[PDB]
Paper text:
Screening of a library in which Thr207 was mutated to all other common amino acids led to the identification of two variants with drastically different spectral properties relative to NeonCyan1: Thr207Met (NeonCyan1-T207M) with blue shifted excitation and emission, and Thr207Asp (NeonCyan1-T207D) with red-shifted excitation and emission. To investigate the mechanism of color modifying mutations, we attempted to crystallize the NeonCyan variants under different pH conditions and ultimately obtained the X-ray crystal structure of NeonCyan1-T207D at pH 6.5. This structure revealed that the side chain of the Asp residue at position 207 had displaced the water molecules that had formed a hydrogen bond network from the indole nitrogen to the side chain of Thr207. Accompanying this change was a displacement of the backbone in the vicinity of residue 207 with the Cα of Asp207 in NeonCyan1-T207D positioned 1.2 Å closer to the chromophore than the Cα of Thr207 in NeonCyan0.95. Comparing the structure of NeonCyan0.95 (pH 7.5) with the structure of NeonCyan1-T207D (pH 6.5) revealed that the water-bridged hydrogen bond network that had extended from the indole nitrogen of the chromophore to the hydroxyl of Thr207 was displaced by the side chain of Asp207, and there was a close interaction (2.80 +/− 0.11 Å) between the indole nitrogen and the carboxyl group of Asp207. In contrast to WasCFP and NowGFP, NeonCyan1-T207D has the terminal carboxylate of an aspartate side chain, which typically has a pKa of ~ 4, positioned 2.80 Å from the indole nitrogen. The approximately eight units of mismatch between the pKa of the aspartate side chain and the pKa of the CFP chromophore are incompatible with the co-existence of the anionic chromophore and protonated aspartate. Relative to NeonCyan1, NeonCyan1-T207D has a similar Φ (0.27 versus 0.29) and an increased ε (42 mM−1 cm−1 versus 29 mM−1 cm−1).
Residue numbers in the entry: 12 to 67, 71 to 236
Amino acid sequence: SLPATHELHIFGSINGVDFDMVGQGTGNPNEGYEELNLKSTKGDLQFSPWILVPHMFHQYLPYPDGMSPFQAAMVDGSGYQVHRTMQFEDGASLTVNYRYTYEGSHIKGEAQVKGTGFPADGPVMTNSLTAVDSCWSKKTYPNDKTIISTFKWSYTTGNGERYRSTARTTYTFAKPMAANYLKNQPVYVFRKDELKHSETELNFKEWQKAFTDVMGMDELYK
């Protein structure tokens, strides 16, 4: 079905220390909006919960004229896997690998996280990140089974100082995407992310809008 509810098991390590979180959410597949609640199964998170944004379900994303490729792959059941890499301005690096299963309108997601090189006194390990910038991503389709998403990410610390990262996401589809998708690229997506957090529990909200009118959107996204 189009998705209506989801759950996330997100787990792995930050600076060689294991964490594990589980929770349920809901979303709007005609608007790309999603809510998620997460709870730790291994006690207090030893890092900023902000570092799990944006990683905490593009199956909810519509396109202007119909379903996104992500949403289309869920509805026919064939699906996709995800690899994301992020390199931070202080030399830290994070990967996330995602796998999904579908039951009618419900998605179960698994996100394996590995983060390394976060300095002890840095704002990740001291939980001093306070917000994230809304931002543009660019989707390209280098072949009928792959989508590449690129974006520049920033957390806020202190007096609006930015803690910057570069992100690249590789989507691998089981079945080729409809041919029309390949002839209508690139796609630009604008997203806004909101987090309420404690050391054990998070409430997350995401809004997203896809744009297929290409223009000089490339000068605007960069």
